[model samples]
Target: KVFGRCELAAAMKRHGLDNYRGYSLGNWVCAAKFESNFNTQATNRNTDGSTDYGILQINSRWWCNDGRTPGSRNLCNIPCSALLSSDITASVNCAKKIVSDGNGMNAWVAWRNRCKGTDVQAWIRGCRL
Candidate 1:
């Protein structure tokens, strides 16, 4: 299911992702908005021959493989399409793993270039914590 800003924030809080791995809920919401428009089925091809999938746009190079490629490290041990879940827990877990791997939100170039250090408080605007 696609989520509105408040709904996503509430979900993040419920999942203990409000500050999971020391990132803010606002940051997560902002990244998700720019990354997938809150659509779980989002996918895009990177110029580097890798792919990005799901709400967080996880990279196929080191995360999951679409199964059509050979270079995917698939460190998350999940299928790339599996990231496109309305439940979102799978994506959440994978994102947590990514953050723990020293990438933090910087794993996604969109997050680093867009959401990072750009006053993200409004990303969760009107959402109750």
Candidate 2:
């Protein structure tokens, strides 16, 4: 499922992503926009043979177990396919786990390149949240 901008924001916040660490809801929203365009089934293969999955594009290299990524840590302890749900709970929770690891939102390159050092608040502009 593809979410509208506000829909994604509201869904993510409902799952505890709003300021989960030092990062704001806008941060997550912006990352999702750049990462997967709010598409739940989004997947991207990496040059390293790992893959990024779902809305937040959580990577198989260290997070979910795709059983295909070489040297994957599967730290999230779930199947990579679980992230690709319109329900989004699994993906959001995995994102939180990544943040809790102290990586913050920088774990995603899209966040670093696009959302970081920018006016992230603009990403959530016009949203009631």
Candidate 3:
């Protein structure tokens, strides 16, 4: 229940976003759906049988390196969950950075406008935001 749709919406609103416009949230959700189905606690097994955890498909090893382990200040450190639990604005902004610096959302919107058939970098350049 932690990551329910309502919670996601609330988080988005808190961050000043309006309905996942363009392909902003859609692109992320698509990737999340493919990567972990939006499950905050979802984990995957690598070809070597290692585990990668959380909504953003973050690896535990990388999270551990950042000092965000099970008992750390930012446990899990999943970007979406952070948006819900911590500063919504900062978390979303962080996600934007991870996806593609300051232009990830713009690129996503362009993809939506172009029906997911355009170059990401070019679309990013065309994004108004």
Global lDDT of each candidate: 0.86, 0.89, 0.42
Clashing pairs in 2: none
- The top-ranked prediction according to TM-score is 2
Candidate 1: regions farther than 4 A off: none
lDDT of 2: 0.89
Per-residue accuracy of model 3 over 47-102 as CA lDDT, tens digit each: 64334544445443333223333333333354323433333444455444444434
Give one digit per residue, the lDDT tens place, for model 1 in 66-123: 8766677989999988999888888888888998888688887888999899888888
User: By lDDT, is 2 or 3 better?
Assistant: 2
Cα TM-score per model: 0.92, 0.95, 0.41
After superposition, candidate 3 runs with Cα above 4 Å error? 5-23, 48-50, 61-97, 101-129
> Worst lDDT window (10 residues) for model 2?
99-108
For candidate 1, the 10 contiguous residues with the lowest summed lDDT are 65-74
Best by lDDT: 2
Q: Model 1 scores what on Cα lDDT?
A: 0.86
